[PDB]
Design a protein around this nucleic acid. Structure first.
Ligand SMILES: Cc1cn([C@H]2C[C@H](O)[C@@H](COP(=O)(O)NP(=O)(O)OP(=O)(O)O)O2)c(=O)[nH]c1=O
Ligand SMILES: [Mg+2]
Ligand SMILES: [Mg+2]
Length: 341
DNA sequence: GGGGGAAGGATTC
DNA sequence: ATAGAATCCTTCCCCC
């Protein structure tokens, strides 16, 4: 099985460039402004000029601007990149029927039934990198390997505007000399919970008793790492179905007062129902971010769909329940709708 | 034992 | 004390 992974390079910023080509060559930063105080927010992405100096996803804008004040700082037009992204994915749907669209900027492709070795898979990578560049003028990065995980690591090395093929002997090489935190799906809390037991690369998973490994990271992550270490990881390219729809907004002040929070929560419900797009949900979760930035949630399921007016009603009850059973102050309030019909 | 709902956890982009 | 969104897994809990 040969998986072709694609992921666009600094996606949000690049769109800003192809839409205003002068931004080229400068360090660019796409920001999410919350409104609390002007320049409160996070950095969605930054181009590799700006990324060179430490501007990365997830940093506060206030910490970005101290490092590059004369860099361009644009607000996010996700609305735009989404339409740009949808056009690119229709381009990939012509190179295989079996395609997983992993996110706004990512796709996996089952090319087992369209090429038969890696040389032609590599060439089909170039085939795709160019038809993107001509149609829509975007550079992307291509990973190639035997399953979704290793085509993802392939692409992470090749960024930016790069193409990479991971053959079966370097697969065996990487299991041996890939530092474990770089495996997709383990971040820093799990990353050193494996350093704390000496695991730095995938190989060492086989050389550790299973029960001690399971007892700490859980069963699913254990089989995940072990099967990856045995060259026995197989999960298929599946059409992704949205399971969750939601919106969450930052309030201008922290508050525990039910009726000042209400308009935001109401605004979040209206916007969430627009995005629902004729899919009727059965579950609603009122989710709040606290002052210390913990995430509290309360949910409810129904034997029937939820209507907008029913959603309004129960949301307040779930929001009520939140502050009854937790007494911090809320900063961002929002809703999530699950269990569609 | 385990399916199923609810809440927290961790990761992703 | 900095966005916004989506997903899978774990743990306790009800129930058969
Ligand atoms: C990681 C991350 C990404 N994003 C958005 C903007 C990114 O451009 C896009 C994710 O694509 P990516 O592969 O995570 N990062 P990138 O495409 O900007 O840059 P590159 O792939 O590392 O070259 O979605 C966020 O809004 N918050 C994030 O924390
Ligand atoms: Mg990308
Ligand atoms: Mg990505």
């Amino acid at each position: 099985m040969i998986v072709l992974f694609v992921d666009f390079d600094y996606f949000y910023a690049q769109v800003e460039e192809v839409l205003n080509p002068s931004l080229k060559g400068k360090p660019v930063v796409v920001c999410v402004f919350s409104g609390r105080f002007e320049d409160s927010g996070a950095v969605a992405t930054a181009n590799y000029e700006a990324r060179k100096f430490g501007v990365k996803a997830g940093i506060p804008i206030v910490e970005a601007k101290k490092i590059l004040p004369n860099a361009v700082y644009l607000p996010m037009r996700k609305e735009v990149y989404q339409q740009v992204s949808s056009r690119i994915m229709n381009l990939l749907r012509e190179y295989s029927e079996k395609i997983e669209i992993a996110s706004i900027d990512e796709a996996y492709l089952d090319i087992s039934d369209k090429v038969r070795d890696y040389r032609e898979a590599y060439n089909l990578g170039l085939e795709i990198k160019n038809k993107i560049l001509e149609k829509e003028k975007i550079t992307v990065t291509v990973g190639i390997s035997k399953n979704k995980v290793f085509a993802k690591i392939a692409a992470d090395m090749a960024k930016p505007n790069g193409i990479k093929v991971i053959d079966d002997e370097e697969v065996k090489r990487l299991i041996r000399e890939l530092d474990i935190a770089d495996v997709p799906g383990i971040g820093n809390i799990t990353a050193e919970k494996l350093k704390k037991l000496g695991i730095n690369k995938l190989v060492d998973t086989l050389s550790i008793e299973f029960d001690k490994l399971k007892g700490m990271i859980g069963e699913a992550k254990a089989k995940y790492l072990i099967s990856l270490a045995r060259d026995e990881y197989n999960e298929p390219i599946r059409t992704r179905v949205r399971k969750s729809i939601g919106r969450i907004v930052t309030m201008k002040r922290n508050s525990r007062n039910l009726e000042e929070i209400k308009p935001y929560l109401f605004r979040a419900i209206e916007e969430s129902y627009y995005k629902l797009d004729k899919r009727i949900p059965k579950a609603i979760h009122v989710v709040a971010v606290t002052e210390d930035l913990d995430i509290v949630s309360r949910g409810r399921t129904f034997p029937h769909g939820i209507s907008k007016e029913t959603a309004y009603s129960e949301s307040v009850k779930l929001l009520q329940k939140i502050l009854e059973e937790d007494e911090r102050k809320i900063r961002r309030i929002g809703v999530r709708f699950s269990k569609f019909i």
